[PDB]
Amino acid sequence: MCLKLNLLDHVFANPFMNAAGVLCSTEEDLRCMTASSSGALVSKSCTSAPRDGNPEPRYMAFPLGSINSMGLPNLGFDFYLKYASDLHDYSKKPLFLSISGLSVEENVAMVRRLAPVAQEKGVLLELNLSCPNVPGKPQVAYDFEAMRTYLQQVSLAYGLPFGVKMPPYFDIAHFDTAAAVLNEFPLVKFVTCVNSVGNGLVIDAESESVVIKPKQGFGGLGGKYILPTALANVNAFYRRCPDKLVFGCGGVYSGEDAFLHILAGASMVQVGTALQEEGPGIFTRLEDELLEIMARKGYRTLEEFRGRVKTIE
């Protein structure tokens, strides 16, 4: 028994991959993720031009999770495109590429150049809608006319199957509205729920100080704090987007957490904070633990329980 699956016309040894942001910035990172047992990998979200990011300290982890405000440091799209084009060993696993340009025009310019490599090599695109934080107006995904524009312009410019990375929502009317926008677009084949829970604040009681330097300590929350939130989002989109895959992300520390995501409807399961904390070895443990839970229950396939979460009465 084993966890292989097939999606978006690619083979995956299992449904586990890193979350965009974590261990995927450098060639070293990417080679390492590739050498791992992950079923797949995603590159750091990129911009046209290299960026240094925000002032350190900008990431911190705690027993219950993480807080970050990295500010989108990355080597520039020319680096990840070249990794996608000449360095990645596709015989090992599929590769997803994340773009998070700061304007629709920035993203349109990137995807046009990515399209041919997608054709030739099979790299897959994840569009980060979560995204920066627009200065007088909210992030793209919390402003649905903006979201509809980006998706229009991008599907025109790329013209292949792609996916989008969503921030969490917290209201039924926004699920309905967001999901309706997404279903306007047939090329969006997958939705990744969720990005970090935006603008938390961790304060350390001993020094009476915030723990990260940018934005007066305010940052995105990962890890055990957001699992119930990530599961609501996965399952809300699972239910509202029947002709799309849902990739779940958020708070996976065990095979159990992974098992819950899948039951909520996840086809792939992404690991962020726990991978940052534990390192790539976590893939062999999560596999094992997930295979153990399946074995105890009599499940031979992920298809047997994907999306089959039970409701009461």
Ligand X SMILES: COC(=O)c1ccc2cc(CCc3c(C(=O)O)[nH]c(=O)[nH]c3=O)ccc2c1
Beta-strand ranges (E) seen in 50-176 are 59-62, 65-68, 95-99, 124-128, 162-166
45 is a contact residue toward ligand FMN (CB under 6 A): yes
CA distances, 268 to each of 176, 226, 246, 265 (Å): 23, 18, 7, 9
220 is a contact residue toward ligand X (CB under 6 A): yes
Residue 179 C-beta: closest distance to its own copies, Å: 13
131 a catalytic residue:
yes
77 binds, among its own copies, ligand X, ligand FMN, none (CB under 5 to 8 A by kind): none
Among 14, 18, 34, 45, binds ligand X (CB under 6 A): 45
**Pick 34 or 100: Cβ nearer ligand FMN:** 100
Residue 97's identity, in one-letter code, is L
Cα–Cα distance, 233 to 164 (Å, whole number)? 14
**Pick 130 or 276: Cβ nearer ligand X:** 130
69 binds, among ligand FMN, ligand X, its own copies, none (CB under 5 to 8 A by kind): ligand X
- Report the b/e string of 84-116 with b at 16+ CB within 10 A: beeebeeeebbbbbbbbbeebebbbbbbeebbe
Interface pattern 5-44 for ligand FMN (x via CB under 6 A): --------------xxxx---------------------x
Which of 114-117's residues contact partners 24+ apart within 8 Å by CB, and which partners?
114/81, 114/84, 114/158, 115/157, 115/158, 115/159, 115/160, 117/81, 117/84, 117/85
Cα–Cα distance, 257 to 252 (Å, whole number)? 5
Cα–Cα distance, 142 to 139 (Å, whole number)? 6
Q: Tokens standing for 56?
A: 């350190």
232 is a contact residue toward ligand X (CB under 6 A): no
Among 36, 66, 107, 267, binds ligand FMN (CB under 6 A): 66
Among 36, 48, 100, 270, binds ligand X (CB under 6 A): 100
- What is the DSSP secondary structure assignment for residue 224, as one 8-state letter? G
46 binds, among ligand X, its own copies, ligand FMN, none (CB under 5 to 8 A by kind): none
Q: Tokens standing for 275?
A: 């991978």
Residue 254 C-beta: closest distance to ligand X, Å: 21
38 binds, among ligand X, its own copies, ligand FMN, none (CB under 5 to 8 A by kind): none
Active site residues: 131
Question: Annotated binding site for substrate, which residues?
Answer: 44, 68-72, 128, 133, 195-196
Question: Rule CB under 6 A: which residues touch ligand FMN?
Answer: 19-22, 44-45, 59, 66, 68, 70, 98, 100, 128, 130, 165, 195-196, 222-223, 226, 249-252, 271-274, 276
